[PDB]
Design an enzyme around this catalytic site. Sequence first.
Site, PDB file in Angstrom:
ATOM      1  N   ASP A 415       0.771  -1.321   0.135  1.00 42.11           N
ATOM      2  CA  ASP A 415       0.180   0.007   0.125  1.00 42.11           C
ATOM      3  C   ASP A 415       0.944   1.355  -0.060  1.00 42.11           C
ATOM      4  O   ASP A 415       1.974   1.199   0.761  1.00 42.11           O
ATOM      5  CB  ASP A 415      -0.979   0.027   1.181  1.00 42.11           C
ATOM      6  CG  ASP A 415      -1.960   1.027   1.169  1.00 42.11           C
ATOM      7  OD1 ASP A 415      -2.845   1.005   0.444  1.00 42.11           O
ATOM      8  OD2 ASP A 415      -1.889   2.070   1.900  1.00 42.11           O
ATOM      9  N   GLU A 444       1.593  -0.039  -4.899  1.00 35.72           N
ATOM     10  CA  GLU A 444       1.132   1.524  -5.457  1.00 35.72           C
ATOM     11  C   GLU A 444       2.212   2.251  -5.511  1.00 35.72           C
ATOM     12  O   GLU A 444       2.674   2.927  -4.409  1.00 35.72           O
ATOM     13  CB  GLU A 444      -0.053   1.875  -4.546  1.00 35.72           C
ATOM     14  CG  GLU A 444      -1.196   1.235  -4.368  1.00 35.72           C
ATOM     15  CD  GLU A 444      -2.268   2.072  -3.611  1.00 35.72           C
ATOM     16  OE1 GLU A 444      -2.038   2.218  -2.515  1.00 35.72           O
ATOM     17  OE2 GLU A 444      -3.181   2.506  -4.079  1.00 35.72           O
TER      18      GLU A 444
HETATM   19  O1  LIG Z   1      -5.067   8.239  -1.027  1.00 35.99           O
HETATM   20  C1  LIG Z   1      -5.392   9.188  -1.882  1.00 35.99           C
HETATM   21  C2  LIG Z   1      -5.621   8.197  -3.137  1.00 35.99           C
HETATM   22  O2  LIG Z   1      -4.495   7.598  -3.606  1.00 35.99           O
HETATM   23  C3  LIG Z   1      -4.838   6.855  -4.788  1.00 35.99           C
HETATM   24  O3  LIG Z   1      -4.792   7.946  -5.794  1.00 35.99           O
HETATM   25  C4  LIG Z   1      -3.616   8.090  -6.513  1.00 35.99           C
HETATM   26  C5  LIG Z   1      -4.186   7.994  -7.801  1.00 35.99           C
HETATM   27  O4  LIG Z   1      -4.393   6.782  -8.296  1.00 35.99           O
HETATM   28  C6  LIG Z   1      -2.901   8.353  -8.886  1.00 35.99           C
HETATM   29  O5  LIG Z   1      -3.415   8.409 -10.302  1.00 35.99           O
HETATM   30  C7  LIG Z   1      -2.568   9.590  -8.542  1.00 35.99           C
HETATM   31  O6  LIG Z   1      -3.284  10.550  -8.782  1.00 35.99           O
HETATM   32  C8  LIG Z   1      -2.606  12.025  -9.326  1.00 35.99           C
HETATM   33  C9  LIG Z   1      -2.287  12.059 -10.700  1.00 35.99           C
HETATM   34  O7  LIG Z   1      -1.194  11.022 -11.092  1.00 35.99           O
HETATM   35  C10 LIG Z   1      -1.689  13.424 -11.211  1.00 35.99           C
HETATM   36  O8  LIG Z   1      -1.254  13.547 -12.383  1.00 35.99           O
HETATM   37  C11 LIG Z   1      -2.706  14.337 -10.718  1.00 35.99           C
HETATM   38  O9  LIG Z   1      -2.545  15.573 -11.321  1.00 35.99           O
HETATM   39  O10 LIG Z   1      -3.057  14.364  -9.448  1.00 35.99           O
HETATM   40  C12 LIG Z   1      -3.688  13.108  -9.030  1.00 35.99           C
HETATM   41  C13 LIG Z   1      -4.051  13.014  -7.426  1.00 35.99           C
HETATM   42  O11 LIG Z   1      -5.217  12.538  -7.455  1.00 35.99           O
HETATM   43  O12 LIG Z   1      -1.936   9.558  -7.182  1.00 35.99           O
HETATM   44  C14 LIG Z   1      -3.116   9.707  -6.509  1.00 35.99           C
HETATM   45  C15 LIG Z   1      -2.585   9.756  -4.751  1.00 35.99           C
HETATM   46  O13 LIG Z   1      -1.838  10.750  -4.787  1.00 35.99           O
HETATM   47  C16 LIG Z   1      -5.944   6.009  -5.075  1.00 35.99           C
HETATM   48  O14 LIG Z   1      -5.934   5.569  -6.188  1.00 35.99           O
HETATM   49  C17 LIG Z   1      -7.209   6.471  -4.212  1.00 35.99           C
HETATM   50  O15 LIG Z   1      -8.068   5.558  -4.163  1.00 35.99           O
HETATM   51  C18 LIG Z   1      -6.915   7.018  -2.942  1.00 35.99           C
HETATM   52  O16 LIG Z   1      -8.021   7.954  -2.732  1.00 35.99           O
END
Ligand SMILES: OC[C@H]1O[C@H](O[C@H]2[C@H](O)[C@@H](O)[C@@H](O[C@H]3[C@H](O)[C@@H](O)[C@H](O)O[C@@H]3CO)O[C@@H]2CO)[C@H](O)[C@@H](O)[C@@H]1O
Length: 771
Positions: A415, A444
């Site tokens: 995780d 992750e």
């Molecule tokens: O704990 C918070 C959430 O964590 C996980 O989310 C991930 C995304 O799955 C992942 O794609 C990434 O999202 C970011 C993306 O890459 C970036 O380019 C964008 O500008 O911002 C996004 C942020 O949402 O990282 C996040 C976590 O940082 C998980 O999938 C989710 O269930 C959780 O709620």
Amino acid sequence: VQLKDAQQTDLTSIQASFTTLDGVDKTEILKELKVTDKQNAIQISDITLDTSKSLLIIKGDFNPKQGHFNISYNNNVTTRQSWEFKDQLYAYSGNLGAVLNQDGSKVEASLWSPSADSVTMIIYDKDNQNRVVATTPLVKNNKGVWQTILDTKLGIKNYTGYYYLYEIKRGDKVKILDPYAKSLAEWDSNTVNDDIKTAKAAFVNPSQLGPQNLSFAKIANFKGRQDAVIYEAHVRDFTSDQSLDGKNQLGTFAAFSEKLDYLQKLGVTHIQLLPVLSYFYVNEMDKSRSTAYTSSDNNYNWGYDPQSYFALSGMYSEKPKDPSARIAELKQLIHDIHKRGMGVILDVVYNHTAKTYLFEDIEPNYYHFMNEDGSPRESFGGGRLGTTHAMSRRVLVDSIKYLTSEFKVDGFRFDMMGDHDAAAIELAYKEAKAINPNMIMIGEGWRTFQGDQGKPVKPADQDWMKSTDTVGVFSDDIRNSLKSGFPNEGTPAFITGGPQSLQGIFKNIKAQPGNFEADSPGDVVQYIAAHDNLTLHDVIAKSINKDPKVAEEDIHRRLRLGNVMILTSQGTAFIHSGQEYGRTKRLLNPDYMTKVSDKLPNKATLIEAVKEYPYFIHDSYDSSDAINHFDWAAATDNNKHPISTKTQAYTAGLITLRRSTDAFRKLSKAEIDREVSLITEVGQGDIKEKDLVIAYQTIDSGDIYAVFVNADSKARNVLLGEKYKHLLKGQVIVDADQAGIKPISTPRGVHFEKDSLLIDPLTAIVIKVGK
Ligand SMILES: OC[C@H]1O[C@H](O[C@H]2[C@H](O)[C@@H](O)[C@@H](O[C@H]3[C@H](O)[C@@H](O)[C@H](O)O[C@@H]3CO)O[C@@H]2CO)[C@H](O)[C@@H](O)[C@@H]1O
Ligand SMILES: [Ca+2]
Ligand SMILES: [Ca+2]
Ligand SMILES: [Ca+2]
Ligand SMILES: [Ca+2]
Ligand SMILES: [Cl-]
């Protein structure tokens, strides 16, 4: 110009933090500055000013054993040891925790707490955990490990099943949970008070529990991470369904085993279990089904608030009061899985703990990642385990080692892996692989790293994939591209009617995502659904904005396209449990039958098109069994649910196909770039740069396979042309209705011409040309 803080950094270096050093001289500081031991003055050898960082580096003979020092200027400050310095003086390599001898007559018990004044073990009745039976002081060694040997002197002849806590004095008595606890008393978070804040640890002997011939998986075709088809299941979910009211208790390891034949038939190679290690917020004595549809205040828990890293949760045990039962039960499950030619992957959550006090009580200012003032960095009202720190790293690596060796676990899913340093996870893998050559690790890899305030380090995230071929990471790029993902969930994408760059889809199918560098297919865990966020079905429904009743087959036709693409892509294949049948997290609650205001239900997403029960849960960690149960009728009852059982058989067939040829499980980017080809090039026929149809060829070691995917809402002519017209001489093994390796004599949803295929809308075709 005042003294703020102070940290001893090595044998002869104390670092004093000040508000400012502007306008003050080395000579004026040496004047006022004075160092003292446990009261005597220490000879001040030299000072060096870092005016930028506002701190003095003080040199002297600051030998640890002359207590902590306190620094005078103007107010005084007692020095604290930095985590690097605590490692230098106290990093211990030996056994930790409590170890029973063969007949349980003695226990050898160790605890690491170098700054404790004293450490007393408190022992509680096996048959009643609230009753205190005995206590014993421990003896501190050179490296700050507190030890004792429990034996006849305490009046107990057999310690097996007895429980314990550690009272630790500093100045302040606090009772703590042995972090190497191998099992626990039955745990109810409602019993928490000011005095006992944790589960009680338990005297157990894992080696003597469960099948003694337990051994690692014997998976056919399995020659690496690329050959893995992972199946993510929660132990409660898999058997919480009411319909199973016809041997073992509800939602337990022993129940789970009864439904393994299903998964054997489904064809998955690995069952990934959501956190089975002990988690905090639960009543393990309440196994009753939650039948109301809700997204809050449920004894249900995914398990992402860790209490122990070695000790299993009682929640999945038939006998939670027997601390030995968990271990024998989980071993029984894992054995049952291995007989079915499959493996286990345990979801493990080292990035944070349930409560900061879990480790901060044991030794303040060490175990967690820290701010520059010693304050622990936190996440979820819980501690961030700072795994650059030697004994924090040990907690992770030793638990990995223990779970791998004791439970014959075949893999781990980390995780929030990006919260850790690469080094910690690399060592974790290396050690785990040393025990089990076929060890597989995923995690992750989101770029979330925080670490110690002013001390950056390489994280175990997506960007780490350039420089290892050990641990693979979830591909959010393929996820987002095929059917949207966090934060922009619901946005029309490849299988939900929103045109996507075919080159980036094709690169993803080669395990080459656009958002990080994957120099090996094994770096990429390909997925479109997980336990997090909306289920595949629900996100499809939302993205196309349609009601699941009316659009059922439209949604399912689209869903099968997602599975086809994941199961014919390179890299490690990942399948969320229920994704095979069209699982939903529908909020079937009366008070939420139509839209409501501002005042929304918890962790729910709305679909406009739907009138009756429009709310679907996208974060079901605290949701009822009614929301979270795996639907067995939907998965296996062909008569009652023909559409979902069709999707299930279809998904099975795709897995069968994926296992039957290494065209979809290639080993290197070199050979993938050579042998995996893009049939639909931009310009050929109707194909635009952004589009909703794509097809690609692969070759195993010499059967050629061609996968065609029309996600468009109209029929589409795929031009084979000169290069790919030879495909017509082959035979169809996947069509609109069915998937497999046998040839289909009367294929549906496709029509062949002299040099092209007319594919039906929302349909996938696969052709095999043997040779
Ligand atoms: O704990 C918070 C959430 O964590 C996980 O989310 C991930 C995304 O799955 C992942 O794609 C990434 O999202 C970011 C993306 O890459 C970036 O380019 C964008 O500008 O911002 C996004 C942020 O949402 O990282 C996040 C976590 O940082 C998980 O999938 C989710 O269930 C959780 O709620
Ligand atoms: Ca099968
Ligand atoms: Ca007991
Ligand atoms: Ca790599
Ligand atoms: Ca809960
Ligand atoms: Cl799903």
